[model samples]
Target: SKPQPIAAANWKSLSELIDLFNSTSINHDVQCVVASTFVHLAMTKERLSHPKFVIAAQNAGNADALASLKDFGVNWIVLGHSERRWYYGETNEIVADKVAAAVASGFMVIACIGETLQERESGRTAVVVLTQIAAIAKKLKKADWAKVVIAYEPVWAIGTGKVATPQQAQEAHALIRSWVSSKIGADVAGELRILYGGSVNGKNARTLYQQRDVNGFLAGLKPEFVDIIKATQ
Candidate 1:
């Protein structure tokens, strides 16, 4: 089955985010989710009330945070994002625990894994990413894979205005898909949705999604960027 394209907007601001959504609408036929700061979660859900769009939290530090998010009607969470791992000191173990806890609590997870410039320079992209995936995989059951989406946001590219070329994106995504199939299970990997995130914009969006294993994206929510969602079709 083809992975239904998923476009996730990770917004970190409030007033502007509200205005942005109010000004533009997502009419594309795609599965989309938005993640905002903790305080913005409620208003985001209230504003983007369409069935195709749901609110997600940027990170849930622990089970307590997960419980609060669930109570607020947020169903999706982005875990282990590059920023969280780098700035917040979230280790593989911490991310794995949070992913398992959230999934166990019935929340959908966009689990991010990627290599930094240093790792990529040293040719450790596969080693670094697979290790991260292995940690998360160890904490979940075969069925848990159903509720998770993996975003391959190379640390060097995220928010740096450096988007991965289609060839580079395809290579990494294929590596991940093949690894999961052999190490996890064919059924589990076959259905996985691996998103490419990191400075993705309109000009590069179409080619990025054209990559065979590049199922979708985790990108900006601006009106100009909605074309990125449309490119999925």
Candidate 2:
């Protein structure tokens, strides 16, 4: 919870960014997580804390990289982001494998799944998302579920400046809850925190948070804005 503004960067910028967050506000507790490929434990070893920050590999292809994060005390990782899935051609199987590996190595995973505009238009939203979730579920034991957070980010809305209506987000989130209830169990479904990502900004943050099953957000743009923080409050 330490990172307020996370920006992508190269190896050089990574260290500078972390230092910037650390020195910004002592009382505010600023932390930043980096998505890196260097696999150097030293990059993150000195900056780990509650509001201080950790590091996550941009992609999970390297088993050694994941182990390095564990070695360095990294606590969180991102999986199945839209760009990775859609742009980089990562399949559901790849994401599931990453999830399994990350969780097995003792890191919390932010597992992402979503539907495209075409899928949403064809009324295959729930089925498509369910299929993805089912694949990930297969790789996870019941206990492993506790370490993963599901992020439902609609592909069409991400970075498009077209936010999903609160109703739309709620419907998607509810469907996710139902899928978890049926596959995992009623208790896991009820207890799991499902986050809605994609075009989520200050204006819509509170409304989206109020949705029936939407526990939080994996925001893309301006997540550190004062208005957004106030909205969460």
Candidate 3:
């Protein structure tokens, strides 16, 4: 429910994409953040004078990569995204290992996890998400969670020209909060932010935002991402 709900965009090269985003105008009210590959962390570091904006990495898969972010002043990272899990074959264990490395090294982690169309049809959505989270939960120290976020990116909805209904998003989000409440304690779970990252666009964002537990978004080439933020108010 904070970072002002943390509306962010993930680009291939964040600092490179910075020119495309109106950070000066939007940071005034929208609280936008940008994310990209690890290669461009230097540029973000060098641009400290730019309007206050948070820079994140698309993914941080290892200790060495995360360690570099600390020195470069990079602040956040999206780990366990659907593409990372589906195309690259990243299992929950691998993502947990990376998240453990990421937080231990001082970078805030947006740990993404969700289910496939098949898994959902099989009614295993909650099971799948909980399992993915459990791996990271075991690795998380009670104190390390301040550096963590959870992104719910349904595998089938990503780039398939599909999106989850507001009801669907609410149901999934509620389950995650419940699952985490049991594992990490209710107070911590209540404090943790869970974002919706499933083909969210300006037209649909308002409804998604209305969902009880849906906090913000993790953009994937959402060209009109600023529109979503503008529509929020």
Candidate 4:
């Protein structure tokens, strides 16, 4: 019960497509589902429903974006995604700033960090991920610790034919939780959640959730993403 599965749904342009995701229920199998969509429309009067149906931005780059999203009643923002890091060339320091701003604004953040296939092959997986965490840790306080969820997604596995084995995912997750324990201490680490990202799909959800260090998923599927989810009640 400590670790809960999460669904991170990214739907852009087709705002009307949200209806399918919006209507999907959070069964006992899932703790919550986050809607990563166009931040501008998240809190409009024609907003989506449910208090727990959190809205997050796919990518947020600065304090202004973080503050504006939070002020607009948005619930979360994703930082350090592979695309932003690879395509936009975001460094750990910049990602740290973005995370700090979200914390300052009292919003939750799914901060992503992971090694590329090259980095993983080079044995720098932990080094890269820990360095990223260390950058953000420089700005964290006790209050901000719980507001952030670590997303361990290897860039190589994202959308590629090769998916990480559950054991592979757990290994990286252990590194993250342990890193958190070292930086902030064991209690926070124990309470912290690490969601396995990259190449996650219906076929692997249950197995992924079974990992000890994996608390949930920062998922990628759209509205139909929930179709694979089984129910308890």
Which lDDT values do the candidates have, in the order given?
0.83, 0.68, 0.76, 0.72
Q: What is the TM-score of each candidate against the true structure?
A: 0.92, 0.78, 0.87, 0.87
- Residue 69 in model 4: lDDT: 72
Model 3 per-residue lDDT tens digits across residues 138-187: 88888887788898987866556666788988899899999888888887
lDDT pick, better of 2 and 3: 3
> RMSD to the native, candidate 1?
2.1
Superposed on all Cα atoms, the candidates' RMSDs to the truth, in angstroms, are 2.1, 4.9, 2.7, 2.8
Q: Which stretches of candidate 1 lie over 4 Å from their true place?
A: 13-29, 159-163
Query: C-alpha displacement of 219 in model 1, angstroms?
Result: 1.2
State the lDDT of candidate 4 residue by residue for 1-233, as single tens digits. 45455656544333454565566666565545454556455442245664445667757666677677777777677888877787798889988888888888787888888878788778899898999899989988866888888888878776566668888888999988888888798888888878877666667777777778877777654644564344111
In angstroms, how far off is 13's CA in candidate 4? 8.4
Residue 6 error for model 3, in Å?
0.9
For TM-score, the strongest prediction is 1
Per-residue lDDT of candidate 1, residues 1-233 (tens digit): 56778988877545565556555565656788888878777777777755677789977767788888898788899999888888888999899988999998889999999989878889999999999999999999989999999999878666555656789989999999999999999898888999997767788888888888988898866664567766776
TM-score of 3: 0.87
Judging by lDDT against the true structure, name the best candidate.
1
Tell me the spans in candidate 3 whose CA falls farther than 4 Å from its real position: 1-3, 12-17, 23-31, 43-52, 159-162, 221-223, 231-233
